[PDB]
């Protein structure tokens, strides 16, 4: 009799690399490099028409962001301004701090402003056809008695968390607008803690017309640690805070600017979430979560069967 | 492979064997047949699954890192951030390349090894009752019906039963 020993083979073999050979066919292999994303980021908070900065200021249309908490803030390219024209001298730094902090927890505070009128509004910032303003900000103007006395107010921090105060300075278009709004000319703001300060002198002049306004507001911020305190000092043009945002001690979040629409996935890339079954990935060097490691190869086949020897 | 069975003294694989990775083909008085060997098949599969278990579904969590794309020229610090990331990627790309080349060489060698072990085990079973024809086939020097072939495949073959018949056939003129 005859007894033959043997092994299987397949018609559809796969080429793999080994130590001694660039191209050897095995019966089966599996891919070790993840090369695709489904194009969506599967805790996300969609800013929709509000970028993270008007979100923080509380512009019209941003109320849906109140109380929001996120791992990744999704900021949209088609976001638009809906309020009084503004700029932020260190724009990208403020945007970083808000995004990294990862929540909009606002704590209202009562500021005992003196003599001056509060809650100034504007046609550039309409809410349901009524003149309005940033709902986190408080536009101070002169009294009906044409008075704007020096403001001198203090907020002490003996909570157990650092406070973020966002405040601004208004730049009128003309001397008339300056006096009509704040009496005094020039205005001036100084905001300070024990160890830091910011001082701003308004700059009067014509800027391009935006929503019917030639003036601008420049926004600033102050962080107040526990055991520190903040002092607001003004003879005009202050856009006052209505309180502060809470800062997490540990800041672990970030922001992603994309038009891609919003599932469950542990690994996030700017291209979208990717499966993490594979040890490596070729999608993006930027990742968040339990992710395969980024490599330069587009493919890496691991043999999962014997050498394929047909005939 | 380093043992010289697969793509070696075994000329080619069997596409018609779809119930196992290794097996037996026989020809006797009752006909020609094929049967898979489950133990050697499973031994190879277990080792490959062991490799997969080390590689599949074991990624590591990273959260806040450094920036890796830049919109403005900055010089020194940005040069350093870019260089750090480029260094890291090249070292991981190396690790990945070597891992696959090494595991694959080993997978091809372990599967060749399992084939060789099955052949060696079968050879010892047959004792003086058969001769190796050099192509993975044994010439069995006695009448071996289906149950006899089956006894070889399942490790119950008693060589003493056939030894006299086999020796007379092997050693003659």
């Amino acid at each position, epitope marked *: 009799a005859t007894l033959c020993l043997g092994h299987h083979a397949v018609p559809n073999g796969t080429i793999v690399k080994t130590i001694t050979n660039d191209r050897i066919e095995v019966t*089966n292999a*599996t891919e070790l490099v993840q090369n695709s994303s489904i194009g969506e980021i599967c805790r996300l908070v969609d800013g929709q028409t509000c970028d993270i900065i008007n979100g923080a200021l509380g512009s019209p249309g941003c109320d849906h962001l109140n109380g929001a908490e996120w791992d990744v803030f999704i900021e949209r390219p088609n976001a638009v301004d809906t309020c009084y024209p503004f700029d932020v001298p260190e724009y990208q730094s403020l945007r970083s701090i808000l995004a990294n902090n990862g929540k909009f927890e606002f704590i209202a505070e009562e500021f005992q402003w003196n003599t001056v009128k509060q809650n100034g509004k504007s046609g550039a910032c309409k809410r349901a056809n009524v003149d309005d303003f940033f709902n986190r900000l408080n536009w101070l103007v002169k009294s009906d008695g044409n008075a704007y006395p020096l403001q001198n107010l203090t907020k002490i921090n003996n909570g157990d968390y650092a406070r973020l105060y966002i405040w601004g300075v208004h730049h009128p278009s003309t001397s008339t607008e300056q006096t009509n709004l704040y009496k005094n000319n020039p205005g001036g703001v100084t905001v300070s803690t024990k160890t830091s300060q910011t001082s701003v002198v308004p700059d009067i002049g014509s800027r391009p017309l935006v929503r019917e306004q030639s003036g601008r507001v420049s926004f600033y911020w102050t962080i107040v640690e526990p055991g520190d305190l903040i002092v607001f000092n003004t003879i005009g043009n202050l856009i006052a805070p209505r309180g502060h945002y809470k800062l997490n001690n540990q800041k672990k979040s970030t922001i992603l600017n994309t038009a891609i629409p919003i599932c469950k996935s542990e690994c996030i890339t700017p291209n979208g979430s990717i499966p993490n*079954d594979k040890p490596f990935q070729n999608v993006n060097r930027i990742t968040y979560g339990a992710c395969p490691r980024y490599v330069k190869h587009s493919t890496l086949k691991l043999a999962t069967g014997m050498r394929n020897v047909p005939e | 492979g380093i043992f010289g069975a697969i793509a070696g003294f075994i000329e080619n694989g069997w596409e018609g064997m779809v119930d196992g990775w290794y097996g037996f083909r026989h020809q006797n008085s009752e006909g020609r047949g094929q049967a898979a060997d*489950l133990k050697s098949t499973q031994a190879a599969i277990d080792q490959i*699954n062991g490799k997969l278990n080390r590689l599949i*579904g074991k990624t590591n969590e990273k959260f806040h890192q450094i920036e890796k794309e830049f919109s403005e020229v900055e010089g020194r610090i940005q040069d350093l951030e870019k260089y750090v990331e480029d260094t890291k990627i090249d070292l991981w790309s190396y690790n990945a390349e070597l891992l696959v080349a090494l595991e694959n060489q080993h997978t091809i060698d372990l599967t060749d090894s399992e084939m060789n072990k099955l052949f060696e085990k079968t050879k010892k079973q047959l004792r003086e009752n058969a001769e190796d024809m050099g192509n993975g086939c044994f010439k069995i020097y006695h009448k071996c019906d289906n149950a006899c072939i089956g006894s070889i495949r399942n490790g119950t073959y008693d060589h003493n039963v056939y030894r006299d018949e086999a020796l007379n056939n092997r050693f003659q003129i």
Partner: antibody
Amino acid sequence: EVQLLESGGGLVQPGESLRVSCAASGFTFRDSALSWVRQAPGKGLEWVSAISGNGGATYYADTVKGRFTISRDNSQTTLYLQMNSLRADDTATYYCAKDESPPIYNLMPGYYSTYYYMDVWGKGTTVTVSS
Amino acid sequence: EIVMTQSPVTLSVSPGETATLSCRASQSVRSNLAWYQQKPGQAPRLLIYGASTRATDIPARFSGSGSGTEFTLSISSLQSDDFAVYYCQQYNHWLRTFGQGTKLEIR
């Protein structure tokens, strides 16, 4: 529907044998693995053994390493478990449980993937070992 | 040969609150880890497998996480019918082991 039904069990004197059947009915083509898990009222779960393909398991817990033996009859689609040399602590509600593995494992459909999780549990058969 | 210890033995959680469970495991284990919901007088039911991947057609309030040694199981929105006992298994040592069990209470 992937339900299985456990038959047999009952009261036995310590030292005797008893085999429990598990009629694997439904979606299970019975090229997938099956397992036995026992639980005594007043105690938690404990994995007993497993079966794969044909004779690939051979997988028994250390408590029953030399006593229990697992049979599989794919022709009649029934899983067995011969419990010999039963002791007092063997009194438990023996559950027959399905076994599933991640699709990356289980290369050959018949053989054992050494990483299984039980998804579909059975009704269970109570076995009491006393005097 | 690889012991599993759940903590605590029993926990009391008001309905609606999130109940976090523990499944500490000696020696490393990541690939395979399955959670179960064994209601009294019934067979165990698979909830999560691997570590975080939940079973088919089970509520999204059952969350799973963990790595290597420490593993957790959190039930988001709790219901009065969740008074079951929960267990966790592991790979592999060619010998799977179960957990001790965590009793969940609901006034």
